[PDB]
Amino acid sequence: DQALYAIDYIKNYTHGKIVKSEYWLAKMIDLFPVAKRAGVSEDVLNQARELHYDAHLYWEWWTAENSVGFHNPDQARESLMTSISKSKEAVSLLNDAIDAQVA
Amino acid sequence: NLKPVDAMQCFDCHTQIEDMHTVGKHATVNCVHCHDATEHVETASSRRMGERPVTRMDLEACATCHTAQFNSFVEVRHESHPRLEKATPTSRSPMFDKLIAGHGFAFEHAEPRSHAFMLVDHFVVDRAYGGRFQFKNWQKVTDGMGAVRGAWTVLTDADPESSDQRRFLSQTATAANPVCLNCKTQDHILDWAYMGDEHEAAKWSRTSEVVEFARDLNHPLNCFMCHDPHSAGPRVVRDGLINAVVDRGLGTYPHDPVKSEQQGMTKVTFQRGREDFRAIGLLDTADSNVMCAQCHVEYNCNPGYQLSDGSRVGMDDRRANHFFWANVFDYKEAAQEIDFFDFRHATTGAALPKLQHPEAETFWGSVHERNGVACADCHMPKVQLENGKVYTSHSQRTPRDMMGQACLNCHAEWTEDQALYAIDYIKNYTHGKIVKSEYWLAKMIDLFPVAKRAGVSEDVLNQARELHYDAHLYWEWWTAENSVGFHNPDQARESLMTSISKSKEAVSLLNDAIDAQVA
Amino acid sequence: NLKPVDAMQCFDCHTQIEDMHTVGKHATVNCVHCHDATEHVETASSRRMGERPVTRMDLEACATCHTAQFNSFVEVRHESHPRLEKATPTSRSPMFDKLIAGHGFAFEHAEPRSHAFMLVDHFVVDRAYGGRFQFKNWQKVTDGMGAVRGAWTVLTDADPESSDQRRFLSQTATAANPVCLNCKTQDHILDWAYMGDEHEAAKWSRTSEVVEFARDLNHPLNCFMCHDPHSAGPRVVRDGLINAVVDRGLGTYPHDPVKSEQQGMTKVTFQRGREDFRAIGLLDTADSNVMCAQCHVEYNCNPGYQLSDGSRVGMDDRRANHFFWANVFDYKEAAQEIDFFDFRHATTGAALPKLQHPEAETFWGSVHERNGVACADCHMPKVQLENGKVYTSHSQRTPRDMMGQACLNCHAEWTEDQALYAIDYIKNYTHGKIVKSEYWLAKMIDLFPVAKRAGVSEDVLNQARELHYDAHLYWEWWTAENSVGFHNPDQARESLMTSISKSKEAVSLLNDAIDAQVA
Amino acid sequence: NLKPVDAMQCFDCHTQIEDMHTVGKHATVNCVHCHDATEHVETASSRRMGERPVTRMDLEACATCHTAQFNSFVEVRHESHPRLEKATPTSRSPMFDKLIAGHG
Ligand code: HEC
Ligand code: HEC
Ligand code: HEC
Ligand code: HEC
Ligand code: HEC
Ligand code: HEC
Ligand code: HEC
Ligand code: HEC
Ligand code: HEC
Ligand code: HEC
Ligand code: HEC
Ligand code: HEC
Ligand code: HEC
Ligand code: HEC
Ligand SMILES: [Ca+2]
């Protein structure tokens, strides 16, 4: 029971970061149509697309990988926090650019 | 081996302790069990401490004579899933990230687990200390006894050379402050003035560097949080609770003055330099409702802002350590009473409250509470033995693990499966209303950017923000509260329906205003 | 609530206790936990007791600070079949009635059950008090905690107005005497002189009226039988054991002088006035082999007869309280040394010994004993907890209930089923030899009447009777002993084969002599 | 205790019931098990009901002769989770609220 509990600690923690990474990716993705329709520049959209590559990589690794972090818990944690960081950066970029078009 | 000291010599200077110790069930328990006071006795005067005696705060100080209670307490319930994030579709709050956006809980909010881990979990959670503190390795997460022996036996500090709150990992926050610790440990009971006010005799206060404070703390939920070590009698030590019940005259049962008088609390104050320093609350009865309410309440333990003008309320303000002592339907009034809110929503800009595990206030007025049932009856019952000396279980956990003693002794008409089914009926119903409340909150929240971009007036946005406060309160109470409605099913239902009503009103307001801008 | 007394005042007249109490792990445990001495202190001098202080012998005196050990001790093992007669085909000795004819055990000899019941079971067994004492009703047989609280809470006396040993039921015996009680209780520890010799300061002795003595006794296996209440250190209190080990110089391990020196006993005497009265044996180590050997030994605790001349040895004689402290192959010499036997066989007329549960003397020289294993390792191991403070189980029971802790910790090469299989191989083999020994004893016994009626000479009959002593000894050791060979399989085997050899020799002798009379 | 009624008297007005009851496996089951028709019989005519008879619709009307089937029927499957909302992520329709918006 103790060994199972140790497994589940890691998997539960990692899964929570997967879910949060997805929340932020989804929030970013859903800003792209708003930004395009608002007339945000291709330069800004391309900056956001570059961030999306990293946000995606540092999330999807872990949904693809079958151990839900157990095989390398510290790496999963660092990666998923990086994904969230990238998505947050993109969300801020896009929101500010949309807000500037509205104003 | 311990050698007894002359307690009469101590009592010559310590009359309050004499009065408690000589009369209670610890009258024969020598001071040496918990104090090393030799240099203190050599140096103290009538009213100056001299050299500080050592006081043991470890739970093993009690375990030599009360091994059964200690061992029960330190048990780890492995079925209580560890480090399980609430903001996931399979946990308590599937849309928590969207709803709580702007608050530090967005960084991590896990389900509770066994009491042994409270202090270590506080130290390591991603929202608390910027990731500064971690388990020494991922094996240590199982070690409840080790956590009890001391947090620093199982944790590491990323930088012992600095004492500032900062981020060591990217997606962490630094929400911890000294007030938090009062619901994780009382190792600081002799080093913290009542309420955490500034005091010349206090090492620590509300305004301390929390990383330095953390390093001085070791043990979870000390045995003496509920039991006076001198009299062995029932008590509370949590300042915020004593402040609500006694200082503010609200009573132990604010809705029931008779029960408050029968099951009351007496504030006892201890001085340093003939100035009030710290306080305890001696209970008339061994009332677990009030014992557990030291921590299982809605509270402030953080900086915030004023509802009136939006100005910052810092840790220095008394409001940074506050027990609202109010049920869900009295809470908005209680927050207005202190002119306080917690955060501004990141998307809507609404001033919002943050709700914390309000089990005590939820339980008030429920059928069980009105019938004289208390937390311990369901969560730490007497042990049933075919042959033996009865004692009280100290493994605070779900009644599902002990249904005979927790439920069926009262409910002789039910089998275990029937009682479980009754629990699940309430929890399933309540959870469905939580989920629906979240759906409507999320729908409303997502209209704010559309409305702002459409040029909807600030007057309309502010009307919607006022609705958001209520929609939020009447939802979040129930994701914060741990029983998923069981503690007060009718109240949960009324509250959650109120949340949905408020969100629907806001959605209609915003949709109509957007539609008017488009036309 | 208990109020502490001034222990230093006691110590002014009790230097012997002072020297034990101030040094051990009970230095902080006030006398009031176990003594009521107020009137004593008012009236005593250092040389005159004055009023006799009260001493508590109840086990609950220890349970308030040691609940885990107490509750473990009082557990009832329901799988240890109760009131199960050994003289049945499905128990230990299918032919016991034929073989033991002439002895009181023919009236009833049940298998042992849990320790909580030892005193009540002693009182109610059909061989002991003529049926005088009974459980209050047949429900009370389950009540281990009640028995521990006191025998007279669960039993009745058929005639409180008489104190003689008498038959109240037809098929009972009156074998109980005061020596028996020393292996059931030590409630009388301050009322019984060493060995039960006559003493001016003794209320009770070997020659007391056992029914009157019985009425003064309440508690089984007091905690202080193994632990000094003053020092908390390991000890024995049983006079017969101290007498064997110390007075007679045999040592704690008669077959191993080195181990005897390392794991020895110090006799401590207590005086009444200027006269030695009682004694204890402080152990060098917490050696359960010697603790359990207070009772789990072969003994005299009864009147008997001399081997030399057949004359009666009554309770007044020191031999009526005797630990032989001899293995099976030294026993005959040990009994010759004190010129003693127990009974004459009803059919054969042979002088025979009666053997009692000789676990201690059987365990000597076994592979486990020689490797430093002790009774507690298999029968009361440390408790293994995922999270908690370790303590020692005090539920003395078969290792089958706790194989992980009792066996597999040492035998990592085995699964539980494998270890059980190894136990059963020995017990099955040994039991088969017990049964065959009984077959041959019974065959011999049944030839005695045929030989007598055929006019076989008394010289031949006496030759056969001498063989009967040995055939009996080398069999009965193993029906008396509770492990069915497991404690010493090679010894059981050698002994039982010797029994069969002796019986076969007697059968041949008697058959030949009968045939010669017929011819 | 139930007392049987004269079914032939009922059948004089109730031919459809006669045709069904006399032929099936309830031919021996008297009307009193399910009907109290005394005032009805006193007042009915060939094709007017008169006073309405009482008809038992409770399932225990069948349980006296068919206890096994009744007891099986009334069993509660506790593993069939109660009051469990379908519009939740762990049930049947995680996005039900959005999709069914406008419906009760
Ligand atoms: C008078 C000369 C004293 C003697 C004798 C003892 N104590 Fe004391 N103690 C004394 C003072 C003036 C104070 C400060 C508080 C006050 O009442 O004014 C204390 C404080 C303590 C404490 C609290 C320590 C802390 O960290 O805050 C403890 C635990 C304590 N004292 C214990 C104690 C014991 C066990 C004594 C007998 C061995 C004892 N004290 C003697 C003054 C005097
Ligand atoms: C042995 C030297 C003890 C130490 C160390 C502690 N306690 Fe104790 N406690 C002890 C005794 C002998 C008793 C009385 C037992 C009885 O029923 O007579 C107690 C009692 C308590 C109680 C019950 C009090 C009541 O019902 O009024 C409690 C709650 C208790 N003890 C708690 C406790 C705590 C929390 C300890 C560590 C600070 C502790 N005890 C130490 C003996 C000993
Ligand atoms: C022998 C081949 C091993 C196997 C099989 C398993 N583990 Fe292990 N584990 C092993 C070692 C030598 C260590 C490091 C010990 C140290 O203190 O240096 C570990 C470590 C872990 C950890 C901690 C991981 C971390 O990053 O800190 C965990 C959670 C753990 N082990 C769990 C675990 C589980 C559940 C296993 C079965 C699937 C398992 N380990 C197998 C050695 C071996
Ligand atoms: C008493 C009024 C409390 C204050 C002040 C703080 N916490 Fe707390 N905490 C409390 C309880 C009763 C519980 C268990 C019930 C629950 O709903 O969780 C907790 C739990 C935690 C946890 C574990 C669960 C989690 O959210 O991850 C953590 C990590 C935690 N608490 C941290 C924490 C912080 C950082 C605080 C100050 C900002 C704080 N707590 C205060 C009771 C109380
Ligand atoms: C509050 C959250 C508690 C903490 C912390 C501890 N105990 Fe407790 N204890 C609590 C209750 C509600 C009760 C029962 C009161 C009633 O009358 O119903 C107890 C009781 C005890 C006792 C008395 C004997 C018994 O009933 O078991 C003792 C000796 C005791 N508690 C000891 C003890 C220890 C050693 C603790 C730290 C491990 C501890 N308690 C913490 C509530 C609370
Ligand atoms: C019985 C009538 C109860 C009383 C009195 C109290 N609680 Fe309770 N609680 C009860 C139930 C049936 C549940 C749900 C448990 C389940 O397994 O479904 C709970 C839940 C909690 C929890 C969370 C436990 C968990 O999920 O592991 C907590 C922290 C809790 N309750 C606290 C608590 C407090 C502090 C009480 C007194 C104010 C209280 N409960 C009373 C049943 C009962
Ligand atoms: C001298 C003035 C004494 C004081 C003070 C105390 N005790 Fe005593 N005690 C004293 C004597 C002379 C004796 C008799 C010794 C003898 O020769 O027989 C005793 C005896 C006891 C006993 C044993 C009684 C029995 O059953 O035989 C006990 C348990 C005892 N005393 C305890 C005791 C306590 C606890 C005291 C302090 C509260 C105490 N005694 C003081 C002399 C004196
Ligand atoms: C509380 C007031 C106690 C009473 C009553 C009894 N004992 Fe005790 N015991 C107590 C303490 C505080 C300790 C020391 C604990 C530690 O580890 O520091 C003990 C210890 C023992 C031991 C262990 C001794 C050793 O290892 O040297 C034993 C065997 C023991 N106690 C037995 C015991 C008996 C049999 C009691 C009834 C006569 C008894 N204790 C009462 C506290 C208290
Ligand atoms: C209710 C109709 C009962 C049934 C069913 C069982 N028992 Fe009973 N038992 C009952 C009573 C009223 C009494 C007398 C209680 C008293 O103290 O006056 C008993 C007694 C016993 C006894 C004691 C018999 C004796 O001669 O002393 C035993 C051993 C006993 N009961 C056991 C028992 C068993 C095992 C049952 C199921 C087979 C059982 N009883 C059923 C009432 C009722
Ligand atoms: C210690 C040297 C003992 C003496 C003296 C007496 N008994 Fe005993 N008894 C002792 C042990 C270790 C056991 C358990 C092991 C076993 O083989 O039974 C017992 C058991 C009993 C029992 C229960 C089993 C039974 O035989 O029915 C009874 C009724 C009993 N003992 C009675 C008894 C009598 C009457 C004694 C004096 C003649 C007597 N015992 C002395 C240890 C010792
Ligand atoms: C001899 C047959 C015993 C009797 C009677 C009691 N105890 Fe005991 N105890 C015994 C042993 C062999 C041990 C372990 C010693 C070792 O070092 O391996 C113990 C230990 C204790 C302790 C110490 C703590 C622990 O290890 O659990 C205590 C406090 C204790 N025992 C208490 C105790 C009580 C209360 C008893 C009556 C219910 C009792 N013991 C009887 C052997 C024997
Ligand atoms: C492990 C190496 C043992 C040691 C050391 C001692 N005993 Fe034992 N005993 C052991 C076994 C495997 C068995 C058979 C149990 C079974 O379930 O088959 C026994 C049996 C006993 C019994 C009878 C238990 C019963 O049948 O319920 C007694 C009374 C007993 N043993 C006593 C005892 C003594 C006093 C010991 C030290 C001198 C001793 N045992 C050591 C295994 C082991
Ligand atoms: C002719 C005088 C009748 C007699 C004799 C009985 N019934 Fe009747 N019944 C009669 C009529 C005209 C009607 C209305 C329907 C129709 O067929 O035209 C009925 C109706 C019933 C009903 C239905 C009642 C209802 O609530 O709708 C029942 C259950 C019924 N009748 C039963 C019944 C029984 C059991 C009789 C014998 C005791 C009986 N009826 C006699 C006319 C006549
Ligand atoms: C006793 C007076 C009965 C009452 C009341 C009800 N039923 Fe019955 N039923 C009864 C008998 C004697 C039989 C025949 C049994 C056989 O196999 O011979 C039946 C049969 C049925 C059946 C089976 C019919 C078939 O297979 O054709 C059914 C489905 C049935 N009964 C249902 C039923 C209902 C629903 C009742 C309440 C309205 C009811 N029965 C009452 C005897 C009795
Ligand atoms: Ca939990």
Ligand SMILES: [Ca+2]
């Ligand atoms: Ca709050």
Ligand SMILES: [Ca+2]
């Ligand atoms: Ca047995």
Ligand SMILES: [Ca+2]
């Ligand atoms: Ca003998």
Ligand code: NA
């Ligand atoms: Na020695």
Ligand code: NA
């Ligand atoms: Na452990």
